[PDB]
Nucleic acid binder design. Structure first.
Length: 1198
RNA sequence: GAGCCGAGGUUGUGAAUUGCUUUCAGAAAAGCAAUUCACAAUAAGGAUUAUUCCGUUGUGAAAACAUUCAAGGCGGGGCAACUCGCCUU
DNA sequence: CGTTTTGTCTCGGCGATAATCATAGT
DNA sequence: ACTATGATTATCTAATCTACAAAACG
């Protein structure tokens, strides 16, 4: 008689909501409220989530964190090297004196940038190793190239020299730190692949293409021939790009069973493919029979202009660097007696690991080579453990009491699917579920071949010894054949058959020289634990060797068989090991079944059920189903449900009765909600704000009372996954406890479909109200474009109709330009009653009389439905007209940071490693402080710099986009002159002049374009810009880094006021906000230098009201009489810069036509947002703007 | 969702070579650079000495948190710290 | 001032299937 | 001798703008 319905139009970043209360029997009803809540998301995410490309803020934050973590790990390696070398007395005096060895161990002292080789004496820098540089000079002159080379090329000369000769200890420290910089490519798993692993990179020329007579797709395929005698494996069709073309290949070879090389082919081109580049560099290094450092040194000797870093050696295997460093260290150990000193080694080991005695005792047996190479520099951490994220068992729970005097439950981790207990349980399940059917008549031929316990025991034994069962093997075990019988499932599908024991038996038979009885249950599970738990190469090898030593087995072929065992797939079952251990005695039948192996609880329950007594834990359905279990002997080969109830006492997942009687339950559920509980963060964010909106509606319109929402309709109109989880969550509100409403989702949740929505919109005229609601925008567009092509006349409706020209018909749709369409969708979903959706989903009647009553009740005499009440369209249109869209504001600028770090804490006279919280106050910046690109400050005497601005320059690649205007912005004038000369030579055509071949030609003959004077090659140039860029920081060289504010970081636009009436405008930078908020002050300075008082500041996604020109709003207040014209004048802050504050009307979501530089037209001009009102008055908003406050429901918070 | 790593790029310091402009006076210096090398920083900053980290996630007024969390015993694993399991509150 | 035009850090591995080559039972 | 099944690599795994901040221009 009176019923409350709420509708939610969930979107990708929007939440449209509505609430209706209708009396259907009297054709009465009304809309309590409507609105649209918007979470600010850019169109990039909305266009990327459909395909998927790193669509997550958390993903970008994680990428930044990973880069940082690599940086601090490199820095920590450098600090440890500094400490060790200072103990060894290897650092130079000037470099060591600027390193802190007492408070911040190994770190540079503040405001210092020392260099290991550049000694700063009384203002002049001198190279530390003059003798080595001189030796390199005679080396170069013997190569006959030049005598003027950089000092810092000595690193490679020393790297080559250190292989076989003595070098100075400071040079050795330089080498060690340089090795710490560049480490190489390495795969942590290792697991050396096939012994051949050819993967050779070659260059071959095609000789002949002989037709092979294979016609496919109306063309006879051909093959390829090479000079060495190799045939390209695949067929070739296009002969134009294959005749005598020198393609490069990564050819792979492998020795097969027959004993010949199966040579594949992989067409690849260098300098664009990582694999080809790496393989070519590695082959060049290896065929020279020299280390990477020696190869680099000789290459640089041959071509002094060669780019080393990033051109010559980009990415090579870490083994090359490790071999070079090992050779250097073993050679230098023979000369430097510090590296052979045990006392110095003990001092180093104590300094590094003073509180870790075990690691000290471990490293006491090694030497400095292992410390520098294996321990410090090339130490790579293993993958972080993820066993804490494993899903928990749903049945077996452990309860305990903590120190807080409470009692919570500790969950049990799920058993791995490959655990032999899980394998046995799954095999028993598959045997129980297995039955046979005949091909002839499709009759239940089973129960004759599998009737007694002997048959099932034989089948279990047969399946135990195999790894995968199929049609033919299972048929042959029963002597049946494919031509006469089938096994009730997919004929060409195979099932797991306890493969683990199969491989275990195979590898325990491969070792031989043992009896065929060593494989038992305990030994099998021990080998399982050894292989699975110990996931590390050397650890696994040592574990296997020690296991073979403990048990009387030969450790010769057992280790060899088990050393290359394939890793297990990461998977876990639904239950835990305890659950399967308890269920298996029930599963087992025959000789594997015994009553003594069933635990006390299940045995007692079985005794009770067979006795027939009355117990509270036994349901009537149990006696209905377990009636056949009269004797305890019948409890053999029971199914999963039976055994589950016997062990526990629950008929499968029985769910709970989650009913919430007040908004406080919803509030605490919000408090207890967990992050990353769904598919992606987008949906969890949307639902978080969704139920928050639901809580706000509940509080506002029902005071949080019980059973306020009689029904909730959720429809959306990829995104299907969020059509049911939300229904389940909100079933806690719309559930009925009388027993007639049962299930995971309450019957009060009725999601719909698009057909009903469209039909009711057309019949009730929601399309009409939307059209004449959006028409004024199109009339304005016609007036702006002084044409009549944005509105189409029709005579039946005697009015205009919004439309777009075909040339602007790319992706325009009328239902996506205004944010109120979310509210419209929510309203149409909410009002779709059960009768309406039933009628429009089951229109197929099979008889006109059966559905004629619904025709009489709902539609007017299939033409038109009755409106829900007399004025449904009218008041629906009014409610759309009086909606203030609520926009979420993200004003998080700083936040409190919590850091927990492991540490040795002195406890009870002993040092034990534990976790400690960081002391003091540490702030976290929640916004991107600046853009990635970094520019330097320069001053140009030929550029007039106005006061308040600076010149910043950065390096750019020289390309075809360098015209006269672009050339004029280069900081240097020599390059400007040269480029102007070259461009004049090429008839003023940047495309021809600055093409890569054109750039190469310019660099070849740069003398002719420089008035005959030599110049270095030009590939990149520095271009300046006259603007306002701020410094990154204040310490070290961070002062010299000038950056630009990141996207969406101008959060504040302050308008300052004098006593006269004049307004002044200024946008607050982010760093000032940081300082003011961390000092506890207000975000915006309430005072300028001139002394003007602050009126207010504007922030993005904030709503302001612009009064009419005649109105004078100073202390009007009265924010209840917001009729249509008032909301029509509400504007939203979009972006700000300098003295400009751009606005878009709050209703507007997407533009009718975005501005394009070609047509030079747009709805809101070039910026797609105006500093003035859209109407004809065209008045500056900031001159008379007054701020309004909106809650989540869009009400005015006066 | 997260973890283990890698290669460049950018700004700055230092250096070798070569340019444009200016001031001294073809010498010297400065501003702006180009090719190559070493190094520093790589979001401002804050702890720590563990082979540990927190800083572009989200919540909300507490400038508080979630994103980490017990006790014991019965075990596997290594040179072992540590890690992987079982058992009861 | 009002308005439009231009620039913005980028690349690798730790992947999936599809297709041909073998390869024993039949 | 024919068939179906077990396995290595080749091929692909997409195809990307958006919109703010501000210098440049009229």
């Amino acid at each position: 008689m009176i019923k409350n319905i709420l509708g939610l139009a969930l979107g990708t970043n929007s939440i449209g909501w509505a609430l209706v209360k209708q009396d259907f029997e009297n054709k009465q009803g009304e809309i309590l409220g409507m609105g649209s809540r918007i979470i600010p998301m850019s169109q990039d995410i909305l266009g990327d989530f459909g395909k998927g490309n790193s669509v997550s803020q958390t993903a970008e934050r994680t990428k930044y964190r990973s880069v940082r973590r690599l940086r601090e790990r490199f820095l920590l390696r450098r600090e440890r090297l500094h400490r060790v070398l200072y103990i060894l007395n290897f650092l130079p005096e000037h470099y060591a004196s600027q390193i802190d060895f007492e408070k911040r161990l190994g770190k540079f002292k503040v405001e210092t940038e020392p260099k290991l080789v550049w000694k700063n004496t009384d203002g002049q820098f001198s190279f530390l190793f003059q003798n080595s540089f001189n030796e390199m000079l005679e080396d170069f002159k013997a190569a006959g190239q030049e005598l003027k080379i950089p000092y810092d090329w000595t690193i490679y000369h020393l790297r080559k020299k250190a292989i076989s000769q003595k070098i100075e200890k400071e040079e050795l420290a330089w080498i060690l730190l340089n090795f710490n910089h560049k480490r190489g490519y390495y795969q942590l798993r290792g697991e050396d692949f096939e012994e051949e692993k050819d993967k050779t990179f070659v260059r071959l020329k095609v000789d002949r293409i002989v037709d092979s007579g294979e016609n496919v797709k109306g063309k006879i395929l051909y093959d390829v021939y090479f000079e060495n005698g190799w045939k390209y494996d695949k067929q070739v069709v296009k002969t134009e790009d294959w005749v005598d073309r020198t393609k490069e290949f990564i050819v792979s070879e492998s020795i097969l069973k027959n004993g010949e090389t199966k040579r594949t082919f992989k067409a690849v081109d260098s300098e664009k493919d990582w694999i080809a580049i790496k393989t070519k560099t590695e082959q060049e290094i290896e065929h020279s029979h020299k280390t990477v450092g020696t190869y680099i040194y000789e290459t640089l000797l041959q071509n002094p202009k060669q780019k080393i870093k990033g051109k010559l050696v980009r990415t090579i295997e870490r083994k090359f660097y490790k071999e070079e460093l090992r050779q250097i260290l073993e050679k230098q150990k023979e000369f430097h007696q510090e590296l052979q000193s045990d006392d110095l080694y003990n001092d180093c080991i104590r300094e590094l690991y003073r509180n870790n005695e075990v690691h000290q005792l471990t490293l006491r047996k090694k030497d400095f080579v292992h410390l520098f190479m294996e321990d410090i520099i090339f130490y790579q951490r293993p993958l972080r453990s993820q066993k804490s994220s494993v899903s928990n068992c749903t049945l077996e729970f452990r309860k305990y009491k903590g120190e807080n005097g409470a009692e919570h439950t500790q969950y049990l981790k799920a058993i791995p699917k490959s655990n032999p207990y899980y394998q046995e349980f799954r095999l028993w399940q598959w045997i129980f579920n297995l039955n046979l059917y005949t091909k002839d008549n499709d009759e239940n031929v089973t129960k004759v071949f599998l009737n007694t316990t002997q048959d099932f025991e034989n089948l279990f034994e047969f399946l135990n010894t195999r790894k995968e069962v199929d049609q033919k093997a299972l048929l042959k075990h029963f002597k049946l054949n494919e031509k006469t019988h089938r096994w009730n499932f997919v004929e060409d599908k195979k099932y797991p058959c306890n493969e683990t024991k199969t491989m275990i038996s195979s590898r325990l038979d491969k070792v031989e020289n043992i009896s065929d009885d060593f494989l038992t249950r305990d030994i099998e599970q021990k080998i399982w634990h050894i292989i699975y738990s110990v996931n590390d190469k050397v650890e696994y090898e040592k574990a296997l060797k020690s296991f073979a030593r403990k048990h009387h087995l030969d450790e010769s072929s057992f280790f060899e068989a088990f050393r290359k065992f394939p890793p297990f797939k990461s998977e876990y079952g639904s239950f835990s090991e305890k659950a399967i251990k308890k269920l298996l005695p029930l599963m087992r039948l025959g000789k594997y079944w015994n009553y003594a192996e069933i635990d006390k609880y299940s045995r007692e329950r079985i005794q009770k059920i067979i006795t027939g007594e009355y117990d509270e834990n036994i349901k009537d359905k149990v006696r209905e189903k377990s009636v056949h279990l009269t004797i305890e002997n019948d409890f053999q080969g029971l199914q999963l449900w039976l055994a589950q109830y016997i062990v526990y006492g629950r008929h499968s997942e029985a769910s709970m009765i989650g009913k919430w009687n007040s908004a406080n339950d919803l509030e605490v559920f919000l408090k207890d909600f967990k992050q990353h509980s769904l598919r992606n963060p987008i949906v969890e964010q949307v639902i978080t704000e969704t139920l928050r909106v639901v809580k706000d509606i509940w509080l506002k319109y029902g005071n949080g009372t019980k059973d306020f929402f009689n029904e909730i309709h959720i429809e959306l109109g990829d995104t299907r996954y969020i059509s049911k989880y939300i229904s389940g969550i909100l079933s806690n509100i719309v559930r009925v406890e009388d027993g007639s409403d049962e299930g995971v989702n309450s019957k009060n949740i009725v999601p719909g479909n698009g057909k009903i929505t469209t039909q009711l919109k057309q019949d009730w005229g929601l399309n009409d109200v939307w059209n004449d609601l959006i028409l004024p925008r199109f009339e304005r567009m016609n007036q702006l474009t002084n044409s009549k092509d944005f509105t189409a006349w029709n005579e039946n409706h005697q009015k205009f109709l919004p439309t777009v020209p075909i040339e602007f018909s790319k992706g325009f749709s009328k239902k996506r330009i205004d944010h109120r369409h979310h509210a419209l969708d929510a309203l149409v979903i909410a009002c779709a009653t059960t009768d309406h959706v039933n009628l429009l989903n089951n229109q197929s009647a099979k008889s006109d009389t059966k559905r004629y009553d619904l025709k009489k009740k709902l539609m007017k005499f299939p033409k038109q439905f009755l409106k829900p009440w007399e004025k449904f369209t009218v008041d629906a249109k009014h409610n759309l007209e009086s909606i203030i869209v609520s926009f979420k504001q993200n004003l998080r600028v700083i936040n409190k940071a919590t850091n927990y770090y492991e540490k040795y804490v002195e406890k009870d006279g002993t040092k034990n490693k534990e976790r400690v919280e960081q002391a003091g106050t540490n702030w976290a910046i929640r916004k991107p402080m600046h853009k990635d690109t970094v520019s330097g400050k320069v001053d140009l005497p030929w550029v007039k710099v106005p006061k308040g601005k600076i010149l910043t320059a950065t390096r750019k690649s020289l390309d075809s986009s360098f015209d006269l205007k672009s050339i004029g912005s280069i900081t240097d004038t020599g390059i400007q002159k040269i480029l102007k000369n070259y461009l004049a030579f090429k008839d003023g055509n940047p495309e021809l002049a600055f093409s890569p071949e054109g750039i190469d030609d310019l660099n070849k003959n740069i003398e002719k374009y420089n008035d005959g004077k030599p110049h270095q090659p030009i590939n990149k140039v520095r271009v300046f810009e006259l603007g306002s860029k701020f410094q990154v920081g204040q310490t070290g060289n961070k002062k010299g880094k000038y950056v630009e504010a990141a996207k969406g970081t101008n959060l504040f636009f302050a308008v300052y006021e004098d006593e006269k009436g004049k307004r002044s405008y200024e946008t607050i930078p982010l760093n000032e906000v940081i300082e003011r908020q961390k000092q506890g002050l207000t975000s915006v300075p309430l005072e300028n230098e001139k002394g003007s008082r602050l009126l207010f500041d504007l922030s993005p996604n904030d709503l302001v009201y612009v009064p009419e020109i005649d109105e004078n709003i100073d202390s009007n207040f009265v924010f209840s009489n917001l009729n249509k014209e008032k909301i029509s004048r509400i504007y939203k802050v979009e972006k700000t810069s300098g003295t400009e504050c751009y606005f878009v009307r709050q209703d507007i979501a997407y533009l009718i036509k975005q501005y394009d530089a070609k047509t030079k037209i747009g709805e809101l001009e070039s910026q797609n947002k105006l500093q003035v009102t859209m109407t004809d008055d065209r008045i500056r908003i900031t001159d008379t703007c007054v701020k309004i406050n909106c809650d989540r429901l869009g009400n005015i918070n006066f």
